[PDB]
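Blackboard transcription, Thursday session:
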Amino acid sequence: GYQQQFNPQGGRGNYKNFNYNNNLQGYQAGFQPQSQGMSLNDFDLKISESTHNTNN
Amino acid sequence: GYQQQFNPQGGRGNYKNFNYNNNLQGYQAGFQPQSQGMSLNDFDLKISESTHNTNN
Amino acid sequence: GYQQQFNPQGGRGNYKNFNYNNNLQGYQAGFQPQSQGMSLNDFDLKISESTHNTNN
Amino acid sequence: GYQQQFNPQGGRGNYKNFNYNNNLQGYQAGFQPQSQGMSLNDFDLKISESTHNTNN
Amino acid sequence: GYQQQFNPQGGRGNYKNFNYNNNLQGYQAGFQPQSQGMSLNDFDLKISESTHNTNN
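(Written on the board underneath:)
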């Protein structure tokens, strides 16, 4: 079938923001998982992210 | 079938923002997973990302 | 079948924004995964990205 | 079949924005994955990207 | 079959915006992956890219 398991073998680290969305014959609208920007719904190794959200 | 498992073997690091979307004969509209920009839905190794979102 | 697994072997680093979209005979409209620009849906190694989004 | 696995062997770095889209006999319309520009859907090694999006 | 795997061997760097689109007997319309311009869908080594998108 579908292998989506969380199976780290050995090693070490930081694990966060794992999201599993199972839609079984359903209705899903307006989804922004792990969103960092602005979402409007009307019905030496360095990674650096900086986001400024201003809603007026 | 489909192999999408999380299987790091040895090593070390930072693991974040893993998103699994399974749509089984369903209706999905307006999806911006891991979005950093602006989403409007009307129904030495360095990576640097800077985003300014102004909604007036 | 389809091999899309996450299998780092040894080594080290930063791993983020991995998105798996499985559409099984479904309806998907208006998808901007890992979007950094502006999405409107009406129903020494250095990588630097700077985005300004102004919605009036 | 199809080999699309994530298999770094040794080494080090930054890995982000990996997107796997599997469309199984489905309907997908209006897709802008990893988009940085403007998407309107009506139903010393240096890489530098600067994008200004103004929606009036 | 088709070899499209991500297999860096040794070395180091920055890896981002890898997109795998598998269309299995499906309908895909209006796709602008990794788009930086303007997409309208109606249903010393230096690389520098600057894009201004004005929608009136």
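Lecturer's comment: Chain B is about 0% helix and 65% strand.
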